[PDB]
Amino acid sequence: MIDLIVSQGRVADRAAWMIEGAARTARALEERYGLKGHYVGEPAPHADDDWSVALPQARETLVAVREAATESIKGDNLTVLVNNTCSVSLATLPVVAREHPDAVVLYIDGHGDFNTPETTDTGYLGGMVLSGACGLWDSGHGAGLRPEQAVLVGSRDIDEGERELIRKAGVRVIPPGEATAQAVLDAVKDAPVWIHIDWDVLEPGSIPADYTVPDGMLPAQIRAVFEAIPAERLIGVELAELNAPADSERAEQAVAVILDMVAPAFDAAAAR
């Protein structure tokens, strides 16, 4: 079955509605699959603070997410985290790497999220997540993920400095036009799999786009990844960064697309 964990505490959020988007996503999953989420953290307003300030402010939420994710990863269920920001994964990815040293992390994101304190232009913690989990800088929440076990999927238009950090560390990049289900399967080989998704990977949703080549990933491409990873190899899934207000029609439509993308994996886990 499925363990649902939901972050509702601020972790460096610079957008207004990502805590609300996580709540609405969790509600849709609860209703579809008959679950009750474990909600962690207290909402706080978004701000443009430096990572050196936002990171300590988030410690209580990050520690609580780490503890809940550890219990779930140690048990027998599919671990599903619905997170306001990618930065929640500074707490979860070190657990995955410790418990499953052979796991491959598919980090599905329009960005590389691979800046360090030395290379960030904006100071935003959310742009430093994968590099922190891989130990290029010290988040205070551990590291241990081998860059050789991390695969960026859907990333594009990466700053040339950050792209070479990625290359030197050994992180593979599969851009949207290469991100077929088989390309992702070939990257994972026989490994167990952790899937992390930032919804900014998606092509902006003017779906009447039959005569133009998309720059982002299409929902069908994400669905095809969830269809291809064998249920017995899937460790867990993190869904992050839906920026949509509570009670908006926009959030209603967004979560319907999300449920369609994740259904192959979640349906299998609920039937395990």
| Sheet with 172-174, edge to edge strand ranges | 38-40, 2-7, 78-83, 234-240, 193-198, 104-108, 150-153, 172-174
* CA separation, residue 178 to residues 57, 97, 195, 214, 245 (Å): 38, 26, 17, 12, 33
Structure tokens at 231: 């249920």
CA distance 196 to 236: 8
Give 22 or 269: the residue with its C-beta nearer to Mn ion.
22
| 111 known member of a binding site | yes
Per CB under 5 A, 110 contacts Mn ion: yes
The β-bridge partners of 172 are 151
Q: Kind of pairing, strands 38-40 and 234-240?
A: unpaired
The partner residues of 248 in beta bridges, in order of sequence, read none
* Least distance to Mn ion, CB of residue 85, Å: 8
Q: What angle do CA 110, 227, 270 make, to 5 degrees?
A: 110
Q: Does 198 belong to an annotated binding site?
A: yes
Which CB atom, from 78 or from 86, has the smaller least distance to Mn ion? 86
- Cβ contact 80:266 at 8 Å: yes
CB neighbour list of residue 67: distance below 8 Å, 6 or more residues apart: none
Regarding 196 and contact with Mn ion (CB under 5 A), the answer is no
Residues 224 and 252: their CA atoms lie apart, in Å, by 23
151 contacts Mn ion (rule: CB under 5 A): no
Decide if residue 227 touches Mn ion (CB under 5 A).
no
Figure out which of the listed residues 29, 62, 86, 158 binds Mn ion, where binding follows CB under 5 A.
86
Shortest distance, CB of residue 98 to Mn ion, whole angstroms?
Answer: 22
Give me the least distance between CB of 94 and Mn ion, in Å please.
17
Q: Is 109 in the site for Mn ion (CB under 5 A)?
A: yes
Pick between residue 126 and residue 192 the one whose CB is nearest to Mn ion. 126
* 113 contacts Mn ion (rule: CB under 5 A): yes
Q: Give the one residue of 49, 99, 200, 260 binding Mn ion; rule: CB under 5 A.
A: 200
Smallest distance from Mn ion to CB 156, Å:
10
- The answer to whether the annotation marks 109 as part of a ligand binding site is yes
| 238 contacts Mn ion (rule: CB under 5 A) | no
Choose which of 162, 198, 203, 238 interacts with Mn ion (CB under 5 A): 198
100/111 with CB nearer Mn ion: 111
Ligand-binding annotation for 196, yes or no, is no
* Number of shown-chain residues binding Mn ion (CB under 5 A): 7
Are the CB atoms for 238 and 1 separated by under 8 Å? Answer: no
Whether the Cβ atoms of residue 9 and residue 43 lie closer than 8 Å to each other: yes
Smallest distance from the beta carbon of 267 to Mn ion, in angstroms? 26
**What is the nearest approach in angstroms of Mn ion to the Cβ of residue 130?**
8
Q: Which residues bind Mn ion (CB under 5 A)?
A: 86, 109-111, 113, 198, 200
Annotated binding site: 109, 111, 113, 198, 200
Annotated binding site for Mn(2+): 109, 111, 113, 198, 200
